[PDB]
């Protein structure tokens, strides 16, 4: 459960991400594919080489969805409804992988927000990514 303070922390941090959201999304993906190669089993149809348009494009989609979630943090289940349907009935990514991407997103943020990524913000962001992950896996069964 996100406390008001958590929501303030997430809005502040993501605010500073602003326009780089797509670039950070792609970086997080690349970090995930290199650190946790098992995640590549879900992207056999992509060119996963560095700088690939497919990864950049996907990174931007992931980032926009997170932007949408931050904007509607009080109403995430509704805001992400179409995305939970998509992952539950179509993509069917095993839930363990959400953790892996969440960690890589956190690392990406840490590497780009030296001043913003305080212990308290780190905690709030981890909580937020866990909530997004919970919503996206809500309808799996």
């Amino acid at each position: 459960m996100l406390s008001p303070a958590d929501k303030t922390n997430v809005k502040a941090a993501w605010g500073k991400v602003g326009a780089h959201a797509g670039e950070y999304g792609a970086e997080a993906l690349e970090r995930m594919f290199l650190s946790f190669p098992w995640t590549k089993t879900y992207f056999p149809h992509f060119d996963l080489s560095h700088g690939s348009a497919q990864v950049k494009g996907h990174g931007k989609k992931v980032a926009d969805a997170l932007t949408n979630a931050v904007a509607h943090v009080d109403d995430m289940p509704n805001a992400l409804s179409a995305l939970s349907d998509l992952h539950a009935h179509k993509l069917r990514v095993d839930p363990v992988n959400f953790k892996l991407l969440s960690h890589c997103l956190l690392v990406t943020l840490a590497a780009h927000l030296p001043a913003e990524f305080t212990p308290a913000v780190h905690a709030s962001l981890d909580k937020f990514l866990a909530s997004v992950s919970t919503v996206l896996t809500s309808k799996y069964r």
Partner: protein
């Protein structure tokens, strides 16, 4: 892996009583029912829409038998699961694109099936031995991923 001789003989003894075809079909079917996202690899298989459809699906049964047969053969080489499963590991990564987390899920469902099948004979020590084996097999199958 590393089993004590009493664990090894526990695994061996119980397995001599297993109908591999039947247990295979059951374990794969229950995997597809309890964790429906695993159905992702099998849409070539027909009707998987209800529990009864999954459990009665002949392709599910056939594949279950193929999987448990390979598993069976690995019980004969508990000292070197990685060598035994290296080719299959490669295949599941490069060609089939199966997230190795699926191997862990199947291992746990298999333990539930053995428990259901054997009842009180599937004692806590026997379960412990089988948990080591299924973790070992999952490991071995994930070893050549990249």
């Amino acid at each position: 892996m590393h089993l004590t001789p009493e664990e090894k003989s526990a695994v061996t003894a119980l397995w001599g009583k297993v109908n591999v075809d039947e247990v295979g079909g059951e374990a794969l079917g229950r995997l597809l029912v309890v964790y429906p996202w695993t159905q992702r690899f099998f849409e070539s298989f027909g009707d998987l829409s209800t529990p009864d459809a999954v459990m009665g699906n002949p392709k599910v049964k056939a594949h279950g038998k193929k999987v448990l047969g390979a598993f069976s053969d690995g019980l004969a080489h508990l000292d070197n699961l990685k060598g035994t499963f290296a080719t299959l590991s490669e295949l599941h990564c490069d060609k089939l694109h199966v997230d190795p987390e699926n191997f862990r899920l199947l291992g746990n469902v298999l333990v539930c099936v053995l428990a259901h099948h054997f009842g009180k004979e599937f004692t806590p020590p026997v379960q412990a031995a089988y948990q080591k084996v299924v973790a070992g097999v999952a490991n071995a199958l994930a070893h050549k991923y990249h």
